[PDB]
Amino acid sequence: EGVWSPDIEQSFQEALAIYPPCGRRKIILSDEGKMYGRNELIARYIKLRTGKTRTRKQVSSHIQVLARRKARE
Template sequence: FQKCDGYSKYRQRQHKDDKGSPDQKWPDHLEEAFFRALVKYPPMGRRKQMHKEKQRGRNELIADHIQELTAESRTRKQVSSHIQVLKPFVESD
């Protein structure tokens, strides 16, 4: 992602005005944790995986991983939305 021209333009545009602002939804440290979780949990379709004694889908696993790395929570829906926003940058490259 970081080598993708479209993604880097997106991040620059997103943070131009509010870098470090408390309103920023995906600051750099959360984005880093998000990418680590994407690598750890590749797409798995509709399958679920046991984690913390509960069946969880990929987005829940990613949200849990972000929580473990940063102590900041993100919901599975926030993760899903973020993936949808970033997907066009990957598909174009």
């Protein structure tokens, strides 16, 4: 196992599927002062499901590393 433990990974694979099925949406995250984003809402759900924290740049990096892997099939 590494940084993204498989237990966290699956929380990320839920977070993905139950925030977007395929990305989507035009910035309907702020109505009051609550300014959210995809990654941050992922990191949040990781906290709510694992207790383990992990910041928005980790969620940034991870997605990019995955994309790379996918592309180099």
